[PDB]
C-alpha cells in the first residue's frame, strides 16, 4: 500500500522464500534477528558474506584495528601523494606468490575496490596489450607492403594473380583494398574467454564475463562478449578457439615473386579463470582443463587471468587456490575476505615482463588505495600469515571435517543429493532436479529455478542455520563459513540437513513451501 | 631495487614538487614529517576530490562508525532484510522534494563507487532501451503480417521505386536480416565535452580525457561527446546519429517499404558541475537543450552528482541549484563520510523495472557499516534547519572573491574563476609559448598545473591539485570548517605563486 524506496520487490521475493529476516548483530560465526517478544535468536551463518569472511564477522582484532587507525587519524583521502602502504601490500602478495608456487615471478599491484574493478583493471591491461601487438603487427605489415611495392615497381617481381580473391587488378589499388582491409579489423572488437558458469562481476565489462544468462543477456549490446568454453570437454575448447581466428591481408615477397597473403590477427584480449567455480557450483579447475588454458595462453599470446576474488585469502587451504590447483596465469586478482569483513578492497596483481606503465597513471580511482582500507588489509594479511602458516593447516582440517559430514549425508541421501564439490571451506552440494517432484509446490519452485532458495528457507526457521545456494538455477547449496566453526556447529548442521533431505524425499511440501 | 608498486606514479610525483607522504590528518590539515621527524602542517583544498564536505577524519563521523563497529553491525548480510537502505533512500527522496519543488519518487540502487553508480545507470538505461526496442519490433511483425496477407489476398501491389532501400517473401527476409544486424549493434551514449563520469570498462567510455579513454575504446560502447558552448550544434550531431530500421506499411491499395525511427541512444550523462572542463557550471541554455533531447529521444537523463552532491555547491544537490530535472541520480564522494567507500543510483519509481534490483547486485553493495556511516553523513548536512547549505554558500562566497581578486591583479596569468559554492578553480592561461625553457617544456607536455602545485606545497605549505585535461587548472574544493585565516593564507600563496609564474622563474617553479 505505502511509499517505499528500495528493496521492495527484493523483499517480497525473500519473504516467499522464507528468508525474510532482518540481521541486527554479528559476531563470529553467528548472526542476530530478533523474534516476536524481541529476544535475540542465534542463527549459524554458513553464506558468510559469500566467502568475504574467512575469520568470521567483527573479528575483535580486526575491530580493534581499525579502531586504532581511525583513532590515529589515518589518512584516508591523500590522493596523489606517497602512499607506501599500497607497495608493502603488493610485497607481502610477492613473498606468498614465491612461497606457493616456487616461481620467481615479480607483480606490480594496482588497487581498487570491488573484485568486478580488479578484474576490469585486468581486461583494460589486457587491451593495451593486445593495442602493442596490433600496433607492431601493423608496423611490419608495412614494412613488407613498402619492400614489395618497390621490387613490383623497380623490375624485379610480379604479382601472383592466383592469390587475388582475397581481395583486384592493379598494384596502388591492391595496397589500398588491404589498408582497407586491415582497418575494419583492427578497429573490430576484441574477444574474452571464460569458462562455462563463470563469474567475474556485473558490471558493463564484467558482467559480459557472467554466464548466468538473466544476469547478462539483457546487457549484451553494450560490452564486448566473452565466449563461454565448456569445462568437462576441453577437447572441445581447440575447436571453438579456433573458428575464432581472424587475418590481416600483407604481401609477402619471394625475391621474383610476390603473392597477398593471411597473417594472424589477435582478437582475444585475456582469457579468465576461477580455481574454484561459484556459478557452476563450487567445481574445481581439473588439472586436463589447467593445461588446456595454459596451451590456449601460450598459443594466443593473451594473458591468463586468474580470478581468486572468492577462492583467495586461505579459503581453498593456501592462500592462493591457483597455486594449489597449479594455475600458471599472468594476472591476478584478489578481494572479499581482504577487506576483513568491514571495508571494502581489491586488488590486480601483474606480472612485471608484461606491465605498461602507462596503466599506473591513467587508471585512478577516487576511493581506491585509501589509507584505511590499505592499514585493515595489511593486518588481515599479518593474521592469515601468522604462526608458520598455521592458519592454512586449520583451514585444511576445518575444511576436511565439513567435507566428510556432507559426503556422509549424500551417501544417505544420494536420492536427492548428486554430489559434494569443491575445497578447503569452500564446499557445496548437489541437489538433484526436482522439475518432476511429486508435491505440486516443490515442482513448481524448481521450475522457476527457486529450489535452492525455498530449501534454504527450511533451514533457517526450522534449524536456525543461514545457508545461500549457487549455481544459475540455485541447484547448489553453498557452505563456506569461517575457519572457526566448531564441531558441534558442524553437528547441528549435520541433523539440519538430513532433516531437510528427509522432507525432500518424502516431498513435504506443506513443510517446505510456505 | 625490486618494486612492487606506483613506481611511475612515485617517480612522476617527485619531480612534479608532489613526492610527500601524509601520515596523519585531522580538518582541513594533512601532515607530513620534515627531515628531523617534526609534523608539518598542510592545508588541504584538494580534500579527496570533493569527498570531505566535513574535512579529515570528523570527530562525530569517527565516533559513529566506533560505535557501530562496538556495536557488531552487521556488514555481510546479503539476500536479507536490510531496511536501512530503504531509510537512506527515504531522506534522500525527501531533501529532492524540497529542493526541485517535484513530488518524484525513487529507487535506490547502492554501490561502492561513483563509477558502479553510474554503471547501474548505464544498464538500466539499456534495460528501458531493450523494452523500446522488443515494442518496435513487435509492432513492424504486425505490418509485415498484414501487409503479406494483403499483398498474396489480392487487395494490394508492392510500389517497386521503394525497393532500392533493400517477390514479396524475398523482401520480408532481406527486412528481417536488416533489422536484426541493426539490433545488435552496440548502443550510443551522449555525454558532455570535457566530462568525466568513471575509468572503468564501460564509464570510462563516457570520460573525454583522451589519453584515459582511447587505449580502451573498442571494448565498450561509446559516447559522443556533445559541445557545452555551442548548443546549436548539439542538434545537428544527434540527428547524424539516426538510425532506421525497414518495415512495410500499407496504403490500403498500395504497399511501400519505408525507413522507421530506431533507439541508438541508451542514455544521456551529465555533470552539473564539469571537473574535467574545470568547474564550469551548466548554463541554462545548455541544460534546456539536454531536457529537449531527452524529451526527443526517449531516453533517460542521467545526472552524475558523484562530485557536486553531498552540499558541496550549497544545496544538496547541484541539479536543483542549476535546474537540470533529470530522470536517474547518482551519488558517492562525501557519502562515505571521509572514511567509507559507498554510491548510490537513483531510478525514478515510473521508469524503474523491477528486473533490475533482483539482477543486480554486489557482494560489497549495501553493507551495514557504509550504510550506517551514510545516515549519520545525511544526519549531519541536514542538522539545524538546513544551516550546514548556509554555511557552504557563504564560506563558498569567501573563496571566490579572494580568487576573483587574485585573477584580478594576475589576468596575464589567470584566464578565469568557475565553480559554485566550495566548488571552484582558476583557470591557468596557456604558458607553452612561455619565456622560460623549463615552464614551456613542463606546459608542453601538459604538467604545469601540477609543477603550480609543488610550488604552493614546498614554499607555502598548502596542497592543491590541478584539474581538466592540459593540468590547466587550480582546483579548491575545502570542507566547509575552511576559516578565513587559512583563506587569508591561500590569497598569499597564490600572489606569491603568480608573481613568480608572471617573472617566468623556472628556477623557482620546476625542480
Ligand atoms: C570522481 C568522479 C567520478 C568517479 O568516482 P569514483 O568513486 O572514483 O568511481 C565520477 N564522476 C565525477 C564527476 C567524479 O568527480
Ligand atoms: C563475488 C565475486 C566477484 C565480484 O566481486 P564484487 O566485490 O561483488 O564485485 C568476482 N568474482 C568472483 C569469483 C566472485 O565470487
Redo the contacts with the bound molecule.
Keep these: 500500500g505505502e511509499p517505499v524506496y528500495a528493496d521492495a520487490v527484493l523483499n517480497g521475493w525473500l519473504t516467499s522464500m522464507g528468508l525474510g529476516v532482518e540481521y541486527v548483530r554479528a559476531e563470529g560465526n553467528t548472526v542476530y534477528y530478533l523474534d516476536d517478544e524481541g529476544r535475540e535468536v542465534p542463527v549459524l551463518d554458513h553464506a558468510c558474506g559469500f566467502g568475504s569472511l574467512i575469520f568470521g564477522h567483527n573479528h575483535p582484532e580486526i575491530i580493534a584495528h581499525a579502531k586504532a587507525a581511525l583513532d590515529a587519524g589515518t589518512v584516508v583521502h591523500a590522493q596523489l601523494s606517497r602512499q607506501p602502504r599500497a607497495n608493502q601490500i603488493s610485497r607481502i602478495l610477492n613473498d606468498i606468490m614465491r612461497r606457493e608456487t616456487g616461481r620467481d615471478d615479480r607483480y606490480n599491484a594496482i588497487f581498487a575496490?570491488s573484485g568486478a574493478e580488479a578484474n576490469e583493471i585486468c581486461m583494460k591491461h589486457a587491451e593495451l596489450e593486445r593495442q602493442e601487438r596490433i600496433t607492431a603487427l601493423f608496423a611490419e605489415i608495412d614494412a613488407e607492403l613498402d619492400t614489395a611495392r618497390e621490387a613490383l615497381t623497380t623490375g624485379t617481381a610480379t604479382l601472383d594473380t592466383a592469390s587475388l580473391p582475397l581481395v583486384a587488378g592493379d598494384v596502388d589499388g591492391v595496397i589500398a583494398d588491404i589498408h582497407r582491409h586491415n582497418d575494419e579489423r583492427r578497429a573490430e572488437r576484441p574477444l574474452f574467454l571464460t569458462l562455462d558458469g563463470s563469474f567475474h562481476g556485473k558490471l558493463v565489462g564484467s558482467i559480459q564475463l557472467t554466464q548466468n544468462e538473466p544476469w547478462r543477456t539483457p546487457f549484451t549490446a553494450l560490452s564486448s562478449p566473452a565466449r563461454f568454453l565448456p569445462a568437462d570437454e576441453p577437447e572441445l575448447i581447440g575447436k571453438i578457439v579456433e573458428d575464432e581466428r581472424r587475418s590481416v591481408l600483407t604481401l609477402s615477397l619471394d625475391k621474383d615473386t610476390v603473392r597477398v597473403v593471411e597473417r594472424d590477427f589477435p582478437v582475444v584480449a585475456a582469457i579468465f579463470v576461477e580455481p574454484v567455480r561459484g556459478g557452476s557450483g563450487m567445481k574445481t579447475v581439473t588439472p586436463e582443463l589447467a593445461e588446456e588454458l595454459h596451451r590456449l595462453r601460450d598459443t594466443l599470446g593473451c594473458p591468463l587471468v586468474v580470478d581468486e576474488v572468492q577462492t583467495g585469502i586461505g579459503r581453498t587451504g593456501a592462500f592462493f587456490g591457483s597455486a594449489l590447483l597449479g594455475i600458471r596465469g599472468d594476472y591476478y586478482t584478489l578481494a572479499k575476505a581482504i577487506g576483513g569483513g568491514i571495508v571494502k578492497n581489491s586488488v590486480a596483481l601483474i606480472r612485471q615482463d608484461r606491465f605498461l606503465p602507462a596503466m599506473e597513471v591513467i587508471h585512478?580511482?577516487?576511493?581506491?588505495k585509501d589509507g584505511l582500507s590499505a592499514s585493515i588489509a595489511l593486518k588481515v594479511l599479518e593474521m592469515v600469515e601468522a604462526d608458520g602458516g598455521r592458519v592454512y593447516q586449520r583451514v585444511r582440517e576445518r575444511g576436511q571435517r565439513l567435507e566428510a559430514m556432507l559426503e556422509s549425508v549424500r551417501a544417505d541421501h544420494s536420492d536427492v543429493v548428486s554430489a559434494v564439490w569443491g575445497t578447503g571451506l569452500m564446499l557445496a552440494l548437489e541437489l538433484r532436479d526436482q522439475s518432476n517432484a511429486t508435491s505440486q509446490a516443490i515442482r513448481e519452485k524448481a521450475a522457476h529455478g527457486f529450489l535452492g532458495y525455498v530449501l534454504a528457507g527450511f533451514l533457517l526457521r526450522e534449524h536456525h542455520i543461514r545457508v545461500l545456494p549457487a549455481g544459475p538455477r540455485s541447484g547448489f547449496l553453498r557452505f563456506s563459513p569461517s575457519l572457526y566453526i566448531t564441531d558441534e556447529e558442524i553437528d547441528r548442521t549435520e541433523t539440519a540437513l538430513r532433516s531437510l533431505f528427509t522432507a525432500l524425499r518424502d516431498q513435504d511440501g506443506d513443510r517446505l513451501v510456505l
Design positions: 575496490n585512478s580511482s577516487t576511493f581506491a
